[PDB]
Structure formats: structure tokens, C-alpha cells
Amino acid sequence: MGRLQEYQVIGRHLPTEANPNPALYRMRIFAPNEVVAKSRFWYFLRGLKKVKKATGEIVSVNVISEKHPLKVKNFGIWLRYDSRSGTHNMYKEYRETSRVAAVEAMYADMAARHRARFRSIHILKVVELEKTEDVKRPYIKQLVAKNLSFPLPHRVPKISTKKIFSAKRPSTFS
């Protein structure tokens, strides 16, 4: 959903005389800005631990930048999708350089193939397959194979869309 950012949202119940020093619940939310991160964090804490926005407050909202965004790695993501029939658990692999990019691709893939919305997907966990062979998706295993090298046949040349008429018929060997 746009430029998603991983946000570390820490939040706690409001302190009372009977119950001081709450439990400081923390969650990682992939959201385009901080307002969505806080709202989704409450949507999840309303679900899980039964605290509310009116009776709670946000301790902290921090950006979790990728440690090494110049290294390609393998991500495995567990997710729960509420369909027309009901909720189903899935697990998908993605070859991206950052956790944010994997989640963005995940959203595009589950929108294209299963017609799933942003509000109908619950990202259970996002892990990195550090060890080879951990990947189970055949497409990803093809990319992780030994000494990969593939040509690019029939490459459509980027011609200008405002160049209407061309004197020479183009070639697709570039």
C-alpha cells in the first residue's frame, strides 16, 4: 500500500491507582505513515489483549530501517486472509532486498491472484531464509540454483510514445 514502512509501535493501558505500571505491549506494523500504524496497532490490541484507544496511549512509534538494503535475501511470510468462505492461513516466499519490499510484493501478489484487500490480510510474521534449501517455492529455488545465466530475447526497444512515425522498422535484439 504505497511506500510501506516497518513501524515499532509500543503502547500501554492508561495507568490507574488500582493498576499502575502496565505491560507495555509492542507490535511491528507495516503501514505508509504513523497514523495508520497507530490505528492498526489498536485494531490488533483490541483483538488480542483487550485494551482500547480511549483507555490506552502510544508509548513509542519508531522506524525499523533494513540493516543491509544492498544485499538480496529470501523472505518467508506467514499471513491470514479472510475470504468469502472464511479465514485461511498461507505462507509465501519472495526474493527482495528489504522486508518492506517483500511485504509490498506480497500485497501486490495477493491482490492479483486472490483479490485480497489491505484490511483482509493479517501478516502473522515475516522471517528471512538465511540458510539455502529453506525456500520451498519452486520459482524462488530456480533463482537460487547454481551459476544462473539467462539471455533476454525479443527485447522491445523503448521508443518515444510521442514519436508517431518511424522511417525504419525496429529490431528486438537489444
Binding site: Y25, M27, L48, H122
Partner: protein, 126 residues
Amino acid sequence: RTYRVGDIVDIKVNGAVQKGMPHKFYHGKTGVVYNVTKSAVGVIVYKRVKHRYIEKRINVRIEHVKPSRSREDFLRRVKENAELKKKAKAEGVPVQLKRQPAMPREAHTVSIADNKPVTLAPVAYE
């Protein structure tokens, strides 16, 4: 219970006795007594229609009508306002009399010591 003429009375309407029962539009309402009988009581209650208000005079007997607890806030507020204004005039200091609408919270810090945050996931699997 004994009822005067001109007291604020709220009605709740049970189903124990069906004699002289009012409609569900009057169920759980509040009005002002103008008429008291041996059994029934005449109450004025305001009614909405479109853009305006019409007073309606209705008759409910004793077991569904009771004195309301809406006005006692007024008497307790005037009593405390008078008494702390008396103390403020005696001690020569300004004090706060009105009701404040509860301004938003200020800034503070919470310690990570002995309160290490826990990490959660959308589903609670255990």
C-alpha cells in the same frame, strides 16, 4: 412514595400491572408533575415532532413513577461552590469554581526497567 405537584419525576414502566400503561415512546422518560390523584399522576413530558416541541399531559400511577436523580447535582454544585468561595474569601486566595472539560494529557516518561515490552502477532498462537 409520596409525590408533590411540580417535582421532576422519571418513569420506567414495568409489565407487572397493565392498568394505565403508557406507550413505548414514553418508556423510560422524564417529566414534571402537575396533577396528583388517589392512584394516577399527571405528568407533562416534552415531545419531538419535525422541527418543534409539544408538551403532552399523561397519566401514570405510582409503581412506575419515581423522583428523578438528575437535579441533585445542581444542589451539590451550588453548595460546594458557595462553600469554597467562602473559604477563598476567608483565606484571600483565588480558587477554581467552574467545571473543566478535561484537557488532554501532558508529557511524561515510562521506564523500560522491570517493564520489558513483549512482541505480539495478529493471531495469539499458543
